């Protein structure tokens, strides 16, 4: 299962034996982001705006803690866009799924998020964020052509293109009327 | 008069070429942006394995 969340994300659970369980979108006290971890400190300090205390020395007894098997997991490239356009917690793969089945799963859905006359700049900015890891040269270009339609002047070019997009059916109609005149006017020159 | 008649002709040609280029620039942008989106969808995605040691920053 995948689910979209708000940035910045911070979760710190104090454990009973005196360690702390941390999952956080940003670094603090040398703890890496995005991967969770069990954290212990030798001297009281403030991390993620709260106090992580040094635990009381304990006596060792025979353990019964479980040790689960490790597991690599491959996710779809655009998992973030799939989770965002559902607005609920959604199933994205299985532990033991093939590359082919995994891909043919949100492909039709994703293809039909096509370019529109009404949010071309907002679309072009998604395409860049999607392309950045694949082709960084193209991303930087797309991002540029994004900010040109949005920012340059008062966004007048964005406006102009948006409007010329919505007019398409009228233009064809006129274009057709011109041909029907031109053909007649031409045929009415030949002897 | 001849200069004004010539100016009108030259203006119309540059005005025609101006449009026929804009038609070609927009048409090429729609084709390339839509293909790249298709390729973005079918790329291999990230891998996660819960290894902390791997993500250490010094």
């Amino acid at each position: 299962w995948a689910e979209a969340v708000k940035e910045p994300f911070v979760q710190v659970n104090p454990l009973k034996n005196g360690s702390y369980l941390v999952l956080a979108s940003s670094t603090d006290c040398q703890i890496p982001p995005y991967v969770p971890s069990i954290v212990t400190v030798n001297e009281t300090t403030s991390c993620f705006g709260l106090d992580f205390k040094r635990p009381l020395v304990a006596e060792e007894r025979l353990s019964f803690e479980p040790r689960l098997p490790n597991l690599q997991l491959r996710l779809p490239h655009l998992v973030g866009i799939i989770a965002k356009i559902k607005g609920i917690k959604i199933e994205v793969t299985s532990s033991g799924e093939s590359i082919k089945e995994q891909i043919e799963r949100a492909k039709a859905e994703l293809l039909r998020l096509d370019i529109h006359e009404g949010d071309t700049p907002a679309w072009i900015q998604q395409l860049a964020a999607a392309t950045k890891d694949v082709w960084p040269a193209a991303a930087s270009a797309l991002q540029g052509i994004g900010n040109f339609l949005s920012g340059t002047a008062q966004g007048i070019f964005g406006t102009a293109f948006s409007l010329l997009g919505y007019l398409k059916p009228i233009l064809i109609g006129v274009g057709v009327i011109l041909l029907v005149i031109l053909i007649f006017k031409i045929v009415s020159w030949i002897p | 008069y001849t200069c004004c008649a010539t100016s009108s002709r030259v203006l119309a040609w540059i005005f025609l070429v101006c449009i026929l280029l804009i038609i070609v620039l927009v048409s090429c942008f729609v084709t390339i942006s839509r293909i790249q989106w298709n390729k973005d969808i079918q790329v291999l995605g990230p891998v996660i394995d819960w290894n902390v040691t791997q993500r250490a920053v010094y």
Partner: peptide, 23 residues
């Protein structure tokens, strides 16, 4: 007169371990 505050080094040890499968 000139009062100043010079920084002086220090450190706190921080151990971290993994949680297979996130369980």
């Amino acid at each position: 007169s000139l009062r100043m505050q010079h920084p002086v080094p220090k450190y706190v040890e921080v151990n971290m371990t993994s949680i297979p499968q996130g369980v």
